Ligand binder design. Structure first.
Ligand code: NI
Length: 296
């Protein structure tokens, strides 16, 4: 955790910034969190803009190339990120970015704070480079073939996002998804050729033609905005969760042709950090982490 930096921006706004990192290196999940507390003389709530960045590896490993009539590998089917507030009713999640479903290859947005408390989200990064807002923070991430959606359970105490395999192209064919189904060939998502004389373990889409999120890693950038009533003097807790759902893709030779299958979320890998937030001192302390895999 960096020591807090205090910056008087002008006679209305003072900003307090801390950066905190926590990671699990066995799971290859890293959280890089930027906490910006905004003290605005003209607004009677404290505002925290929390940017969640870092890494979630897909967990992909190559299939065994010697597998002859049946093979399989695990891949990054979906990434989940959430931020939740506990232990104080005077704290609420009030805004966040991205705000709407988005399947563009790159997500690039600015979240701006205006004197008096208004939050706006604009498309593109100019909004946080033109410096027109009293405070802004940007998100910038690649998610080619994947789709970001806001979780249905999002409410005043939690925001989460799902970044899910959505429209995957396989050597010009597709698009395919985690669920695609043909009665003859199964899910052809990462199948090499329907008739290939190759080994099962060498009858998959070559790794570099898979999406980066499927075989490599996701680099999340998400913003949560939390408000805290200035009257309240109590600390609060924030839990930040990064998660991958690992799917198992398989192929099998059935007499005349290959069949592909995708099993969803066969291993769920989760990393959570919990911070104590001091609103009076604009400081955060890491009080807990936890890691889980359902099927290592
Ligand atoms: Ni779509």
């Amino acid at each position: 955790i960096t020591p807090v930096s205090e910056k008087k921006v002008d006679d209305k706004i003072t900003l307090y910034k801390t950066t905190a990192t926590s990671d699990n290196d066995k799971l290859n999940i890293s959280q890089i969190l930027t906490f910006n507390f905004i003290k605005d003389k003209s607004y009677d709530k404290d505002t925290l803009v929390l940017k969640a960045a870092g890494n979630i590896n897909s967990g992909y490993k190559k299939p065994n190339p010697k597998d002859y009539n049946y093979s399989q590998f695990y891949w990054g089917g979906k990434y989940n990120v959430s931020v939740s507030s506990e232990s104080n009713d005077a704290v609420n999640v009030v805004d966040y970015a991205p705000k709407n479903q988005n399947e563009e290859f790159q997500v690039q947005q600015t979240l701006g704070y205006s004197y008096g408390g208004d939050i706006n989200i604009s498309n593109g990064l100019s909004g946080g480079l033109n410096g027109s807002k009293s405070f802004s923070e940007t998100i910038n991430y690649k998610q080619e073939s994947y789709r970001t959606t806001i979780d249905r359970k999002t409410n005043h105490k939690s925001i989460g996002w799902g970044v899910e395999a959505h429209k995957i192209m396989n050597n010009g064919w597709g698009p395919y998804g985690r669920d695609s189904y043909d009665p003859t060939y199964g899910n052809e998502l990462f199948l090499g050729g329907r008739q290939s004389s190759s080994n099962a373990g060498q009858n998959f889409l070559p790794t570099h033609q898979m999406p980066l999120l499927a075989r490599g890693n996701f680099n999340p950038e998400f913003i949560s905005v939390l408000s805290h009533k200035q009257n309240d003097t109590k600390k609060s807790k924030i839990k930040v969760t990064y998660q991958r759902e690992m799917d198992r893709y398989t192929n099998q030779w059935n007499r005349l042709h290959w069949v592909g299958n995708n099993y969803k979320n066969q291993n769920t890998v989760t990393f959570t950090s919990t911070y104590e937030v001091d609103w009076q001192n604009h400081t955060v302390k890491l009080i807990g982490t936890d890691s889980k895999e359902t099927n290592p």
